[PDB]
Design a protein around this ligand. Sequence first.
Ligand SMILES: Nc1nc2c(ncn2[C@@H]2O[C@H](COP(=O)(O)OP(=O)(O)O)[C@@H](O)[C@H]2O)c(=O)[nH]1
Ligand SMILES: C/C=C(\C)CC/C=C(\C)CC/C=C(\C)CCC=C(C)C
Ligand SMILES: [Cl-]
Ligand SMILES: [Mg+2]
Lengths: 481, 182
Amino acid sequence: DNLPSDFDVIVIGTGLPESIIAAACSRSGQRVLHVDSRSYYGGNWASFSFSGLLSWLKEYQMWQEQILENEEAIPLSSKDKTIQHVEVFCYASQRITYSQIIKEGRRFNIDLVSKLLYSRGLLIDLLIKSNVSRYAEFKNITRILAFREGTVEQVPCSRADVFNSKQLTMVEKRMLMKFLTFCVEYEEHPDEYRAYEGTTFSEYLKTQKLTPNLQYFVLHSIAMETTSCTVDGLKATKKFLQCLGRYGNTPFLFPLYGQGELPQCFCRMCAVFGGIYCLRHSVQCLVVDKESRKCKAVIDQFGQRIISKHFIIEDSYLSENTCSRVQYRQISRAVLITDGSVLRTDADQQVSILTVPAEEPGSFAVRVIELCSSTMTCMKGTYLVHLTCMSSKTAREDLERVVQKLFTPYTEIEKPRLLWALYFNMRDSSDISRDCYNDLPSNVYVCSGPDSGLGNDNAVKQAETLFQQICPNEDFCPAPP
Amino acid sequence: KVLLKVIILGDSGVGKTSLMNQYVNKKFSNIGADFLTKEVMVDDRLVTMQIWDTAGQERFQSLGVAFYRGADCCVLVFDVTAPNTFKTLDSWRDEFLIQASPRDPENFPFVVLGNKIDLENRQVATKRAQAWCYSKNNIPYFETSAKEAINVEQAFQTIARNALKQETEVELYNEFPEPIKL
Ligand SMILES: Nc1nc2c(ncn2[C@@H]2O[C@H](COP(=O)(O)OP(=O)(O)O)[C@@H](O)[C@H]2O)c(=O)[nH]1
Ligand SMILES: C/C=C(\C)CC/C=C(\C)CC/C=C(\C)CCC=C(C)C
Ligand SMILES: [Cl-]
Ligand SMILES: [Mg+2]
């Protein structure tokens, strides 16, 4: 087969936002070409088998002739620089040994992105409406966890939980119900919080009918850095409460095989409606009409000039020159292979989220998501643990302390054993305005990579905003006929 | 409701999509293929067969890993009038093993379909294909015609049966409950 010379939309990168927009454009009738320079889908949203991940690690450890005089070229990146400070530690022998992890390497699906799916939210709504939901399966998150004086414990997550709690006094239960009842319908009691709109949520809670113990739970386990405004906290608290019980006792779900499956789900929709897919296919440069200033085509790695009306490019593919003024943020990540849960119980197949507030000001709160083998992301006998936080320093510097208090790296003596650990910082290019990039043609749209939030509102919103610009007056991802 | 996941692999143009459509809808066209389901009978047992199409992602060999997961049977197709498509059969089989990573690889159910026999200029001999399928753990071989509806229903009878045997063995080892569907 041979690649067509013209398309309506060319999308470079198969991360989550790019794939949702590709699927949206193809569904609406646009002829889409979707490429990725990698030999697998997802960009920084991908998951890996264990050997796949070892392969991924390594990395971070002329067309001029075809340009006519009335055109100019904008070269694209030739090397990905979104990943920094990779540090891998193997504590297992080189019951479970390193050799056993390798043997069962194909049982692992290790995400570069640690996120959960809110039972009610933009992505789950989109998955259901578009019918992309048929391409995946999910597991309920069963436990919300927190630290109670150096000890990890499960926090109440339902009416029944508050009733059976022996850790809250009768007055506290009354205070809590009263307060969460209000949070649910908060926007209906304006003056109730009006005076505290310009103050932090943490400060607000201090002026409410709640003990400090209760305030802590609300702030760290429900609303979930520390300077967020009162209204931001109320919206968060309400969202959490509203999600309760839609699919399970908590507000979250997690996709079977990992988050890495989602981008592929949207790419399939794109493919189903005629989108054309080329992995292992990079683009060398954009061809811009020197006069109109609009991008006319791309020249790929094989020197083929391909025409399009719209060009969607994920940030990591733009050159350092195009991005010379951009100020990125960073995300600290850690991936752990462990041999026991952070909270041991009879029932082992628990999927949990533990929040770890910053010990001292200056650093950010840490999220810890524990995946059991039934999530199909790790081998039987292990758990896959993901830690995440907005970065302060290197990922190991921001995260090793938390790892140190939850696990032991030894075989000989409570703490589950840490078998394998990976630390890395990932570029956060979310919320960056077009104007930050240099000389972008108006028909070149930029997608960001993963953001640091728990859910996927950022990816869904940017995709819908782009879709509106490219396919005005069209429905966004309607179910197939 | 026992559900069987079947995927159809092979080079672009051999008739993978037409074979799926012929089986399920008993129709053949001269634009939105995804996956179809059909309630089939496998040795007196009613089962749901779910057949997944490549959605054209194979054109430039860009089928990702999620497409292969949970597959109970892998159908390999080639055009009897196109020796080139028959020669890639080994590559697609190897790719299925790498991508799906099933338990007991060597005994995974593959079924080979020599399609377009309705054409008067075949170039791959029946004996030559049967031999190849034999060199791969005695893989069942069928010659089909999506167009003239020949041997399609018959070929899917063993696909269904072999997929049922595989999924049954998979469920026998499954300790986890059913995952959530939105
Ligand atoms: N004569 C004939 N043409 C067929 C047969 N099966 C498929 N085709 C045709 O061959 C082309 C490719 O078929 P398609 O089903 O899209 O196969 P795919 O690319 O493998 O998924 C189309 O032009 C079909 O009409 C068959 O049994 N006989
Ligand atoms: C749809 C909205 C409802 C049902 C609001 C009323 C709130 C209920 C029934 C509370 C469920 C209980 C929790 C979320 C417990 C949180 C407690 C701690 C973190 C100590
Ligand atoms: Cl979400
Ligand atoms: Mg097809």
